[PDB]
Every structure is written in C-alpha cells, then in structure tokens.
Amino acid sequence: EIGTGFPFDPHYVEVLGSRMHYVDVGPRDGTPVLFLHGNPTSSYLWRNIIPHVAPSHRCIAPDLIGMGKSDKPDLDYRFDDHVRYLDAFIEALGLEEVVLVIHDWGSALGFHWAKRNPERVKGIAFMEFIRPIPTWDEWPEFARELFQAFRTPDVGRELIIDQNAFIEGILPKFVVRPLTEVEMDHYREPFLKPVWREPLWRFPNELPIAGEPANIWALVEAYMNWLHQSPVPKLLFWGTPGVLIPPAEAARLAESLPNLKTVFIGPGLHYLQEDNPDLIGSEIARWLPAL
Numbered sequence: 001e002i003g004t005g006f007p008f009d010p011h012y013v014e015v016l017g018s019r020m021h022y023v024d025v026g027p028r029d030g031t032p033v034l035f036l037h038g039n040p041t042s043s044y045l046w047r048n049i050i051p052h053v054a055p056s057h058r059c060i061a062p063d064l065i066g067m068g069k070s071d072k073p074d075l076d077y078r079f080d081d082h083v084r085y086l087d088a089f090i091e092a093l094g095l096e097e098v099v100l101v102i103h104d105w106g107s108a109l110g111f112h113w114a115k116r117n118p119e120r121v122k123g124i125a126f127m128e129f130i131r132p133i134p135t136w137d138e139w140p141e142f143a144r145e146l147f148q149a150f151r152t153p154d155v156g157r158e159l160i161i162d163q164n165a166f167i168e169g170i171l172p173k174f175v176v177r178p179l180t181e182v183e184m185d186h187y188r189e190p191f192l193k194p195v196w197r198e199p200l201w202r203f204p205n206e207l208p209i210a211g212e213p214a215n216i217w218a219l220v221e222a223y224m225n226w227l228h229q230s231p232v233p234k235l236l237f238w239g240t241p242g243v244l245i246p247p248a249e250a251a252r253l254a255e256s257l258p259n260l261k262t263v264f265i266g267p268g269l270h271y272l273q274e275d276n277p278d279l280i281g282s283e284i285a286r287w288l289p290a291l
Contacts, residue, residue, distance in 0.1 A: 002277060003048050004182040008061075010069060015088045021069035022089075023061040026054040031097050031122055033288070034090070035061040038104025039203035040166045042068030044186045045103070045273050052281030057099070057288060062089055064106070066199045068190055077202045079216060082109055099291065101125045101284060103273070104244070105203055108216075111223040118230065123291045125284050127237035127272050128244045132220050133209045140243055140269075143173065150204040160201040161194050174243060174270035183274075227257060234260040235287050237280050239268015261287065 008023040023043045026033075033053055035046045043061035050059045063070040065085040066077055075081045086109050090098075099122050102110035107129030114121040136144055146169070150156040159165040167188055172179045179187075191197050208217040227234075234257055238250035245253075254262045263283050265276040273280060 004180055006044055006047050006186060013089065013092045015085055015092055018065060018071035018073045020065060020071065020085065020089055021063045023050065023059065025050065026058040028058060030057055031099055032058040032060050032095055033099045033101055034095070035059065036100065036102045036106025036110045037064065038106045040171060040191065040200045041187065042190065045271065048277035049273055049281040049284070052285045053288070056285065060093065072196055077199045079108065079206050083112060086113065096120065097122050099123045099288065102129065103127055105130060108220060111227060112219060115223045115226040121232055123233040125235040125287065128242065128270050130208065130220055131224060131244065131249065132217055135210055138246065139209065140241065147204055156205065157201055161197045164191065164197065166200045167191055175274045176267040176269055177275055179274065231258055233291055235284065236260060236262045237265050237272055238262065239265045239272050239275065242268060243270035
C-alpha cells in the first residue's frame with residue numbers, strides 16, 4: 001500500500017535571500033543522497049523512496065524555489081533561475097561529494113550540476129528525465145495536443161495559470177494508478193493561488209522538443225554528451241509506456257551509457273515514484289553499497 005503521509009520534519013536554509021525547505025534524514029556522515037523533483041511536484045514525490053535509503057545514507061530532498069514549502073520570490077522562473085538557487089542550496093549545505101537521485105526538471109538540474117562538478121558526483125540514479133526529444137511524434141499521443149497548447153501563446157497560461165491544468169490534469173494523468181485526494185491535496189497546497197503558478201507554466205515552455213527552445217536544447221545536449229563519456233555509476237528506472245523515456249529510449253541508453261544498470265518498474269507513465277516506489281527505493285538502497 002502506497003503511503004500518503006509526509007513524516008519529515010521541515011528544514012530551512014537561506015539561499016540568495018530566500019528560504020528553501022528540504023527534507024534531511026539519515027546518518028549525518030557518509031556520502032549524502034540528493035533527491036531532486038520536477039514539475040509540479042516537491043519533496044513529497046520522494047516520500048516513499050527516502051525511507052529505503054535513510055537507514056544507510058543521509059537523504060536530502062529540497063523543494064525547488066517557488067515550489068513545495070520553499071519561498072516564492074519575484075523571479076522569472078526560467079531554468080537558469082532554478083540553476084542559481086540549487087547551486088546556492090548545495091553550497092549552503094556544504095555538500096562535497098553527492099549521489100544524485102533525479103526526475104524530470106530535477107534531472108535537468110542534477111545532470112547540469114554534475115557536468116559542471118563531475119568530481120563531486122559519486123553516482124546518479126534517474127528516471128523519466130529531460131532529454132532532447134526529437135519530434136512531437138515521440139511525445140505520448142494522449143498528451144500531445146495538451147502540451148502543444150501549454151506552449152501556445154495565451155492559451156497555455158489560461159490552462160496552467162488560470163485553470164491549474166498541470167496539477168488537476170497532467171499530474172493524475174501521468175500516474176497509472178489513481179492518486180488519492182490526500183495525495184492530490186499535498187500536491188495542490190503550494191499552488192492554491194494562480195499568482196503562485198508561474199513555475200508550472202515556465203517548465204513545459206522550456207521542454208526541449210523538436211529543437212526548441214534552442215537554449216535549453218543545447219544545454220541538455222551538453223549534459224547528455226557529458227553523461228555518455230562519464231564513468232560515473234548510473235541507475236535508470238523506466239516503465240511502460242513512459243512519457244519522457246519510452247521503452248525504445250531506455251533501450252538506447254542501456255546500450256550507450258557507460259556503467260549503467262537499468263531497472264524496469266512495470267506500468268509507468270511519468271511519475272514513476274507514484275506507481276512503484278518500493279521497487280525504486282529498494283533498488284537504490286541495493287545499488288548504493290557498490291559505490
């Protein structure tokens with residue numbers, strides 16, 4: 001049975017003049033494991049993963065700026081803003097070497113940080129991560145018109161900002177099993193007001209699909225190139241049919257990435273942590289000793 005509670009004491013740290021919230025559990029020494037969520041989630045997404053890792057390793061799960069329990073400064077909320085705040089968060093906590101556990105826009109942040117700090121990354125576990133998607137044909141058909149509308153002037157803001165489409169529509173449609181009302185209310189809480197929803201609209205407008213936007217496309221290409229030459233231990237979780245990482249892409253990564261273990265989790269769309277947390281958490285726990 002998949003837990004709905006969030007039994008983690010809040011921790012806060014001042015970052016660039018704002019407060020950021022994070023989970024921090026597990027032993028106080030050793031290599032920390034840094035869990036990075038994406039859109040439109042928070043550290044809540046990791047709530048059933050972390051308890052598998054916390055017996056043996058420090059677990060740190062921040063809420064990205066403007067998300068979860070973190071502050072909501074007056075930012076553009078472009079990808080580079082998230083880069084700046086996560087960079088400063090990692091330094092504020094004095095992290096030296098880390099293991100990354102990353103998902104969605106948290107994976108773009110994590111891989112981009114790893115490329116810039118390769119000596120500090122001891123391993124990377126990832127799932128449903130940001131890759132350059134070559135055509136809209138590789139996007140799931142049932143969500144293609146919706147994500148094209150998110151990236152259409154005016155219409156996308158009406159859907160995401162005014163109608164909260166990313167929380168009420170996309171989030172439950174990208175989990176195979178049904179989310180409960182308690183889980184939905186945890187995901188809803190940081191975005192109850194439209195004025196808080198800018199990050200939810202910025203993120204799909206930065207997805208690198210069919211070459212655009214060019215700046216994100218090049219950045220993601222750069223860290224994918226880094227990943228392909230890196231000897232760092234890697235662990236990929238994938239499901240079927242997937243969203244960002246269809247089975248054919250999981251197969252391509254299994255062939256091309258060095259030092260990669262792959263784990264098929266069964267049915268899965270995008271929020272794989274909500275479909276098979278016990279397999280994801282237990283397999284990360286089993287993989288960490290080999291690092």
